């Protein structure tokens, strides 16, 4: 039975790496300027041994994505449609009153809980953000983890600096990272402290002779953008401000962590037995350019928390830590080494892919929104899964009170506009012809737009979505307004 590592980077979009995730018309990687700015040599090492997905969808912000990864359910269905504010219910003015602020529940068959039931040692390290303060989900031990280092209801760290006690000595006390007291006062960067702790848990799992699931959930690369002195000297582009250079150092330190975990697997002799899934949790938050133009994920439009592709396009790499044709466990999930997969995947697809390789099954009667990636991981187009992603955000952020719906080449953006709830607005893009969202064409294809609204409307109902409300609590369902 294989070990599984989900290496999840906070606020890391598809361009925040030296690995090119943009595909040309031949399905081959194309280098863009951000790929020559970031330095992720261990991601390059992992891409050499595995498969990159060029189109991989997450939700637009943290808790919705982290809920979706744990449950295999869309944010419509698990109900965590906003990032969770630990201290108070952040519905936002027009948010659904019954949205799942409390978060993941002790009774949910989460990926870790199903693995734990099967005898896996399940380890959580770093950012959890599965529940509010005082909730079941605040504590990863309540949703199927045997071990939690540094996870709580917090969604970012009080500091990256060990000298600042990660918030306990200096910085934001109410976001102080827990469980790392032995690093306080030292010059150990938060991302380094988490790596040391993860490698200690991996070592302990191997000596106990149990297969493990490691949720390596970095606080990197979320603000505050506090530069790592180990890497800052490499970042000197005159058109990148101090914040962007700090962000680049959080990326490079994240990549060092990935390398130290891969080295530890090789040192223990278990690399042949360990699957690594690498992704970000939502659209990239790099402090570059213009938030609703081109910057954080150029050449794609937008940023973390927007309705654009930059809001929800994350990097995704799957690789055996040491590929080996002889390996029994690798025959259950063969990966085309050094290749790019251009067919769409989503964070809901992780649940069914991991449970199958682990020798478990998706519980037959548990309704999921994910598809086993086995066929796509071999480097083939999988006709058993749709080219579709539905990103429901009935809350306030860089974009507000919207649903996006992608079906094949087409993307609908529906704005509920709760302040003028009788006059909603729909936009239409052809992402095949216009991947940078430059050519809004609802006026030119009014029937494609009408059809997408009906399909999206039916899918929101099928998934049990909670809708935004107007000032007086009237439920705002999408409708063909024209």
Ligand X SMILES: CC(=O)N[C@@H]1[C@@H](O)[C@@H](OS(=O)(=O)O)[C@@H](CO)O[C@H]1O
**223 touches ligand X by CB under 6 A:** yes
* Residue 83 contact among Ca ion, ligand X, none, beta carbon within 5 to 8 Å by kind: ligand X
Q: Is 281 annotated as a binding residue?
A: yes
**62 touches ligand X by CB under 6 A:** yes
Of 268-287, which residues contact ligand X (CB under 6 A)?
Answer: 285
Out of 304, 374, 406, 411, the residue judged to bind ligand X by CB under 6 A: 304
**66 touches ligand X by CB under 6 A:** no
Out of 156, 301, 385, 406, the residue judged to bind ligand X by CB under 6 A: 156
**126 touches ligand X by CB under 6 A:** no
Backbone angles phi, psi at 166, to 5 degrees: 55, 30
**Residues forming beta bridges with residue 213, ordered by sequence position:** 4, 122
Q: Is 239 annotated as a binding residue?
A: no
- If the CB atoms of residues 60 and 199 are measured against Ca ion, the closer one turns out to be 60
The CA distance from 363 to 376, in Å, is 22
Token pair listed for 157: 């760290």
Token pair listed for 396: 């306030």
**245 touches ligand X by CB under 6 A:** no
Contact 115, 355 (CB under 8 A): yes
57 burial class (0-12, 13-18, 19+ CB within 10 angstroms)?
Answer: buried
**395 touches ligand X by CB under 6 A:** no
Of 253-312, which residues contact Ca ion (CB under 5 A)?
Answer: 281-282
**406 touches ligand X by CB under 6 A:** no
Length of the chain: 482
Instruction: Give CA separation, 171 vs 15, 157, 177, 220, 226, in Å.
Output: 29, 9, 11, 16, 11
Provide the 10 A C-beta neighbour count for residue 430.
17
**11 touches Ca ion by CB under 5 A:** yes
The CA distance from 259 to 239, in Å, is 29
* Residue 223 contact among ligand X, Ca ion, none, beta carbon within 5 to 8 Å by kind: ligand X
Q: Kindly state the helix (H) or strand (E) to which residue 203 belongs, with its residue range.
A: helix 190-207
Instruction: Give CA separation, 53 vs 318, 338, 379, in Å.
Output: 9, 11, 10
Q: What is the residue-wise DSSP string for 59-112?
A: -SSHHHHHHHHHHS--HHHH---SPPPSSS----TTS-TT--SSBS-TTS--HH
- If the CB atoms of residues 155 and 421 are measured against ligand X, the closer one turns out to be 155
**339 touches ligand X by CB under 6 A:** no
**10 touches Ca ion by CB under 5 A:** yes
**61 touches ligand X by CB under 6 A:** yes
End-to-end Cα separation, the chain, in angstroms: 55
Out of 83, 130, 278, 429, the residue judged to bind ligand X by CB under 6 A: 83
Total residues in contact with Ca ion, by rule CB under 5 A: 5
**222 touches ligand X by CB under 6 A:** yes
Contacts with Ca ion by CB under 5 A lie at 10-11, 62, 281-282
Residues annotated in a binding site for Ca(2+): 10-11, 281
Contacts with ligand X by CB under 6 A lie at 10-11, 61-62, 83, 129, 155-156, 222-223, 285, 304-305
């Amino acid at each position: 039975r294989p070990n599984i590592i989900v290496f999840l980077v906070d606020d890391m979009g598809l361009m925040d790496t030296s690995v090119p995730f943009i595909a040309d018309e031949s399905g081959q990687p194309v280098r863009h300027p951000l790929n020559d700015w970031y330095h992720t040599p261990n991601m390059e090492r992992l891409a050499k041994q595995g498969i990159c997905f060029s189109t991989f969808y997450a939700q637009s912000v943290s808790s919705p994505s982290r809920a979706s990864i744990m449950t295999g359910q869309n944010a419509t269905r698990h109900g965590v449609t906003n990032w969770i504010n630990a201290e108070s219910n952040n519905r936002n003015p027009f948010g659904p009153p019954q949205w799942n602020w409390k978060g993941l529940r002790k009774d949910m068959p989460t990926m870790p809980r199903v693995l734990q039931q099967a005898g896996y040692k399940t380890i959580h390290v770093g950012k959890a953000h599965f529940g509010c303060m005082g909730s079941e989900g605040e504590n990863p031990l309540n949703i199927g983890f045997d071990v939690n280092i540094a996870g709580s209801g917090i969604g970012h760290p009080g500091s990256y600096y060990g000298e600042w006690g990660y918030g306990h000595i200096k910085g934001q006390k109410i976001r102080a990272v827990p469980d790392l007291e032995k690093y306080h006062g030292t010059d150990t960067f938060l991302s380094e402290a988490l790596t040391i702790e993860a490698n200690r848990e991996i070592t302990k799992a191997v000596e106990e002779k149990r297969p493990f699931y490691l949720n390596m959930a970095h606080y990197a690369v979320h603000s505050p953008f506090q530069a790592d002195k180990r890497f800052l000297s490499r970042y000197t582009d005159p058109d990148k401000n101090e914040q962007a250079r700090a962000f680049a150092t959080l990326i490079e330190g994240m990549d060092k962590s990935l390398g130290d975990i891969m080295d530890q697997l090789e040192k223990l002799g278990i690399a042949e037995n360990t699957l690594i899934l690498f992704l970000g949790d939502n659209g990239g938050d790099a402090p570059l350019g213009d938030e609703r133009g081109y910057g954080s994920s150029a050449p794609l439009r937008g940023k973390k928390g927007t309705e654009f592709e930059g809001g929800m396009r994350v990097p995704f790499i799957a690789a055996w830590a040491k590929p080996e044709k002889k390996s029994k466990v690798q025959k259950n999930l063969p990966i085309e080494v050094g290749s790019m997969q251009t067919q769409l995947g989503t964070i809901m697809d992780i649940y069914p892919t991991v449970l199958s390789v682990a020798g478990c099954e998706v519980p037959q009667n548990y309704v999921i929104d994910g598809f086993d990636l086995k066929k796509q991981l071999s480097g083939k187009v999988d006709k058993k899964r749709p080219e579709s992603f539905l990103m429901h955000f009935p809350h306030a952020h860089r974009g507000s009170y919207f649903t996006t719906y992608r079906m094949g080449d087409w993307k609908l953006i529906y704005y509920y506009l709760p302040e003028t709830p009788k006059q909603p607005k729909a936009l239409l893009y052809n992402l095949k012809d216009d991947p940078e969202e430059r050519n809004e064409l609802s006026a030119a294809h009014p029937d494609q737009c009408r059809e997408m609204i009906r399909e999206m409307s039916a899918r929101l109902e099928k998934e049990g979505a909670l809708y935004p409300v107007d000032k007086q609590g009237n439920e705002l369902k999408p409708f063909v307004y024209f």
